[PDB]
From a paper:
MRS2 belongs to the CorA protein superfamily characterized by a highly conserved Glycine-Methionine-Asparagine (GMN) motif in the loop between transmembrane helix 1 and 2. MRS2 assembles into a homo-pentamer and displays an overall architecture similar to structures in the CorA family, with slight differences in the secondary structure arrangement. Along the pore, R332 and M336 have been identified as the main gating residues.
Four Mg2+ ions (termed Mg2+−1, 2, 3, 4) were identified along the pore and two (termed Mg2+−5, 6) were found in between neighboring soluble domains in the MRS2-Mg2+ structures. Mg2+-1 interacts with a ring of backbone carbonyl oxygens of G360 and amine group of N362 with a distance of 3.8 Å and 4.3 Å, respectively, indicating that the Mg2+-1 is in hydrated form. The radius plot estimated by the program HOLE37 shows the narrowest region of the pore is formed by a ring of M336 side chains, with a pore radius of 1.7 Å, followed by R332, and N362/G360, which is part of GMN motif. Mg2+-6 in site 2 is sandwiched between two negatively charged glutamate clusters from two adjacent subunits. When overlaying the HsMRS2 structure to the archaeal MjCorA X-ray structure, in which 28 Mg2+ ions were modeled into the soluble domain in an asymmetric manner, the Mg2+ (atom spec: MgE406) between subunit E and A of MjCorA is close to soluble site 1 in MRS2; however, it is coordinated by E155, Y186, T90 and Q62, which is different to the groups of negatively charged residues (E138, E243, D247, E312) in MRS2. Interestingly, adjacent to soluble site 2 of HsMRS2, a salt bridge is observed between R116 from one subunit and E291 from the neighboring subunit, with a distance of 2.7–2.8 Å.
Author numbering:
A (entry chain E), B (entry chain A), C (entry chain B), D (entry chain C), E (entry chain D): 84 to 400
The structure:
Amino acid sequence: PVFTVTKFDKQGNVTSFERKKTELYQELGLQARDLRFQHVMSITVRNNRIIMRMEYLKAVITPECLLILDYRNLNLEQWLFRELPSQLSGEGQLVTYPLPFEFRAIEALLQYWINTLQGKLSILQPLILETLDALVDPKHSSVDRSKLHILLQNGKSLSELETDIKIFKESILEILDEEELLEELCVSKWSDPQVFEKSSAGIDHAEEMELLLENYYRLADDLSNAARELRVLIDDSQSIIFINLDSHRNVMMRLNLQLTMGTFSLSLFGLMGVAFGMNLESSLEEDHRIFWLITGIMFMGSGLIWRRLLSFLGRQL
Amino acid sequence: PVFTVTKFDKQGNVTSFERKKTELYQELGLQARDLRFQHVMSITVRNNRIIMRMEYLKAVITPECLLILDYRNLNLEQWLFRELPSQLSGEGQLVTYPLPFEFRAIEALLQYWINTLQGKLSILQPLILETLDALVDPKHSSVDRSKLHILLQNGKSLSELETDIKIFKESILEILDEEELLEELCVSKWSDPQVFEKSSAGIDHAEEMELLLENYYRLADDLSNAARELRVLIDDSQSIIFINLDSHRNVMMRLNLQLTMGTFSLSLFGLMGVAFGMNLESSLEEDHRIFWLITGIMFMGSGLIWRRLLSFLGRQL
Amino acid sequence: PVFTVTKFDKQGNVTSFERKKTELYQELGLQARDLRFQHVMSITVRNNRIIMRMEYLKAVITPECLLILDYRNLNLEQWLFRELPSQLSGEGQLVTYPLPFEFRAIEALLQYWINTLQGKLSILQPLILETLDALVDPKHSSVDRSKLHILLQNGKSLSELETDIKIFKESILEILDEEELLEELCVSKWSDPQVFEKSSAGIDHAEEMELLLENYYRLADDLSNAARELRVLIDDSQSIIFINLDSHRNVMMRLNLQLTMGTFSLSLFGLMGVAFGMNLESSLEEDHRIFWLITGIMFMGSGLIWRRLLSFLGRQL
Amino acid sequence: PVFTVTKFDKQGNVTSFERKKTELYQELGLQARDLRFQHVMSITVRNNRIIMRMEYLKAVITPECLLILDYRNLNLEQWLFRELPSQLSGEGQLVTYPLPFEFRAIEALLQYWINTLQGKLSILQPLILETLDALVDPKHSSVDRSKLHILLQNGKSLSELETDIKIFKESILEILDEEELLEELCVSKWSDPQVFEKSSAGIDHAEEMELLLENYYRLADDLSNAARELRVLIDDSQSIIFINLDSHRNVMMRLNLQLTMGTFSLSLFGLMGVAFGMNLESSLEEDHRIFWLITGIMFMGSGLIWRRLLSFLGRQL
Amino acid sequence: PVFTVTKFDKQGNVTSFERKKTELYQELGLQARDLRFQHVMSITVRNNRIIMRMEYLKAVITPECLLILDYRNLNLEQWLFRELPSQLSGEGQLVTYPLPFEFRAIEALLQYWINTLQGKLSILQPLILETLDALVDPKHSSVDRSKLHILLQNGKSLSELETDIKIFKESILEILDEEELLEELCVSKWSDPQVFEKSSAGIDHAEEMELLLENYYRLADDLSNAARELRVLIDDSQSIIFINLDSHRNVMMRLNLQLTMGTFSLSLFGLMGVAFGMNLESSLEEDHRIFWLITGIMFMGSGLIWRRLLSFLGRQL
Ligand SMILES: [Mg+2]
Ligand SMILES: [Mg+2]
Ligand SMILES: [Mg+2]
Ligand SMILES: [Mg+2]
Ligand SMILES: [Mg+2]
Ligand SMILES: [Mg+2]
Ligand SMILES: [Mg+2]
Ligand SMILES: [Mg+2]
Ligand SMILES: [Mg+2]
Ligand SMILES: [Mg+2]
Ligand SMILES: [Mg+2]
Ligand SMILES: [Mg+2]
Ligand SMILES: [Mg+2]
Ligand SMILES: [Mg+2]
């Protein structure tokens, strides 16, 4: 096929072209299996070439140049053509530390990925915090139906972000743990064992590579703790939501039971009113002191039975 | 008994026959304990023979041939006779890497198992996603009864798939961790310490075996993260289902309580209508301005008591 | 006190007797602290003697004999007198592998314990599967009261079985990890450094002991995964049970609310029927076109209010 | 200040006195930072002195004596003056193993703490088992209100006990893992490099110290599994309690809905009875075959509507 | 920019000033990347300087002085100017241990952070305990709405505190695990390899640094267990809250069902009273022994049906 290559030289100059994969393997001195890019996160060195893939960002770091592959249709235009050249050129920062190009390229790629991981968390966190805050207030019998889908979607994005940080840390820690892997990153040292050793002023050794990789492992470790705390907060907030729903359930069920007692009291003493309303000879239809006596009994009796019933639920706490 | 053997030579030729287990041990130079195949996942080397079992796939890799055992009644016909010979023959790919037959056979077997593990996840994931998506919508008082059995069955298949990936990774990592185990896989090297060493051009050494095994450990590690995220999503979606069920429970319980208040108001003020309907002398049956006054009181009184009761639940939030 | 000893010689002959603990220490060349048997799972070697305890099975493996202690009232009669002698005698299997008696005794004891652990799971699994299957069907408002106690008891037995497998694996892995511990198991080698070394044909070395112990670690590892999946299935099934109970709760609560609306509609429009049934002058008792008009209003009005109320809950989704 | 010291010599003699902390540091050859006792669990050796703290038990093991500090108001009277002297004196047990005083003192202190940890579990376990057993029976609509506080308190004590076992195991495993730490416990060896080496009969070496410490690590490991299983059982029992509560909730809700259907049927067909009871001209008050016809319709119609409604919930499963 | 520096010399004298970052790098012999302070918890040594950050506390420990950076608007006035000088001066404590300034500065900084971590837990624990205690009492149908927000906020602060302790332990354990990292803390040793070695009386070696760092790892380990137990107690208490809410839900639902049975009984037998109240010829309006017979049937029949219905729910347990 073809690889859309954006090539940065040691001076930060940007050249973009297109080359066949078969010809690129010979030009880079690699094989077809080296540039398969079939791992979502991987930082490997194959024949003096640093091959890194971070999700959509596939790059190869050569002794003298940095190549970005498959840079189209991925919003890799502002960083690639305006921010990346400045970092690779070495301008500013410190002029007393002329580190090799591999250190500048590895730092630029690692910094870029830690920025997208940080940016993803800086967007998820306000969304989850604002959705959980209004879902957890104990002032409603129910919850917002639409905002539960937001929490479900944002929780899924949080778990995918947690994996992205986790596999970023594993890739860096794999190189840090093994000294041979860490030494392989010093690409210019092996390309020129004599020219690079001439400037033996501590420009790049095992310490400088370890310091660079440990810096981004700790930055990603900060992301892991912040993303893990957010996931813990989601679980804690949902448990408070469950107590809120089941507490107002009991409040409405107590009011319903109190009103049920009142309707039973009226029905119990309204039965004698219904009984005395039948069109049968009650032998009392002529008395003038029976209607008001029964009417008083029904109203007072309903009140007394209601008061007695209300103490029944109070007895049941 | 007998072993149904499908034998592939160094040229990919397929020969199928049947041999007694006792005779196969002598032919292979093995013992009865070596070919017990009592472990669901195992990759061991016994006397210059690579013995691998992956669930139903049992294979022995010899210096010059690959044997597949118990290949019947397992749908091992398309891969065995059409896809496996092409991979073992070495055609295509790279003609500049004449790797030994053991590397080709190990890669073909490891690739096949990572494809079935990937295929199992590629089927479970859409089924779980589509069942969870329609179970979680907050537009129904209840959930689909039949689709809960689908989620239960698919969740069980997901946990069995998670174990299959987990024990696949452990088997590969066991060989990767120990250099002696990794060196044992170089079967042709030990069979011919001089003939194999003649082609000392980096065809097969500790790096090539490590690169092959690390490739499939990372492919299975990708499967572990994808299957673990799916299990996390199931738990997150069920918690949202619980909030949905308990929120509409509170909505229906609030409507029921509001209607209960209305029926109590009618019953409370309908008692005086029942009282005035008895066949007793009320001393008011002749007045012409008492019927409409009481009728108005009952209807207005029911409304006022209902309005007062509705504020009672509003006071209870 | 006394130890009920069942002694098996190198030929598998069974002798049972009773000896005092104090005399047994001198006969075995051990101490009182060595045979305390105070650990539920332990495989230790003390002065050229392999001392193993597996729950109720306490055994000491000597250079020339195997002793089983406290074999009474534990159903250790079929295995001890019919199955164990055959395995220790070395008959069958392979006649070309004259392994020492310690290998035969360790294998027989380890095989026996992996069989009881497998048998315990082969009984728990059908019981849990059949109880969960009928508890999870979404065709009942509630669950079987009696079968919840079965699940509680079987879940407790599953967790105790999980610990039995876990501590069995730890005991084997402790010996496997340390080469000195693994070498101590070669009891006959240290008893006869010259006689055993005479048959230097690979009968028993570090590989044969490691292969035997790794075989039973992997068999127990299979048990751990099967028992862990069952525990995961219990948790998954209970969550589906909770959704089933809370979905039929909402179905019955929706039917109750729909019938509550119908009774309120009848009560609301039955109040005018009660109002017109009082024994007061309504100034309409003589008209012939008022009774049927009011009766129609009550029945039609109840229907219209019921239809309007039914749309109210539909508005609330 | 002052330290309340209970001193045991090599013969088990008990002497109790009080000494200032400043003078005790010089007498013991220690510093103020060594005897801070600010760690709840700690077993450290500082200048040939074994300093151990186990919650309230603070002890210093010297070459020739064992000192217990802060032994007042802690029920340390029966063990200190009646049980501890017997163990330290070396009487009974084995007279052929004249182990140094440090081994006897370490064993006595470690045995005492494993007894209090075992005793705490032997009290919690029956309390939790008896509370869970009667809370889980499916014969009550609710649970015992008072016994939920017992489970909450006993669960809190179980988690504190789990930490006590966990940090006891970590303290022992720290010494076991490092050989230098294990060698420091041989206090008499370093105090008298020549006198102790004279009795080179295996009285105390790296094996005897390792055997003593591994014995109590495994005893505490047994406690960890028993306490962990109890915590798992609490969680399993509570989930069964939730199913019990939500199953009888559905049973009472089905009975209430069935009775609600019956009251609606009476109200629906009682409306025509109320309609025919108004004091309006119905044009049917003179017929003799209308009263019983309507009365039959109301009673039969209520039954038919009730039967039809009962099938409605049966349709909803 | 500028760094607000509070400088403490070897005598504890406090000097506060303001210096530009660029000039401070040259004065301290460091680089811009060394003082980035972009890690929430970090204890690193860069060119004979101990650089530590603990949340808001950023400090650099030099051979002869301790510098605190960004000390404004953080309540760092009482500790900085009244408590810190006393600890750094070396007054009191022990005059026989003239440890270097780095040991005094590291101890003062580590002690300060363990005090703020302890103080945060000493505030959270009473707040959570008092909120959980009154939320868990089984004497209310519901829970306090306002106190659920307190538990949610305090649970979030507890999880952030748990991370603060966790990363404090990781930072200390990283130095403890690696001897080279631990040796780098001995700043005065490398600054003066001969002057420091002159006082070879055990003032500061690998043991003294290890003892200081292990002391604060164990103090933070105590905090981890106390904060972890509190989080476990929150989860246990919430599960008891759920049982309390669902038990009183069943109690109120049983009372409501018992009263529903009573109202159905009155409605069932009140239908014959309504039937006999219609203005139709019942052919019984003249009999004198029919009114009281029907009235008795309605009242007795309601009681008998109610008693029969009450046994129905008793049959359903
Ligand atoms: Mg992801
Ligand atoms: Mg490698
Ligand atoms: Mg499986
Ligand atoms: Mg091996
Ligand atoms: Mg109700
Ligand atoms: Mg009613
Ligand atoms: Mg057990
Ligand atoms: Mg050992
Ligand atoms: Mg009337
Ligand atoms: Mg504790
Ligand atoms: Mg140490
Ligand atoms: Mg934090
Ligand atoms: Mg380092
Ligand atoms: Mg519930």
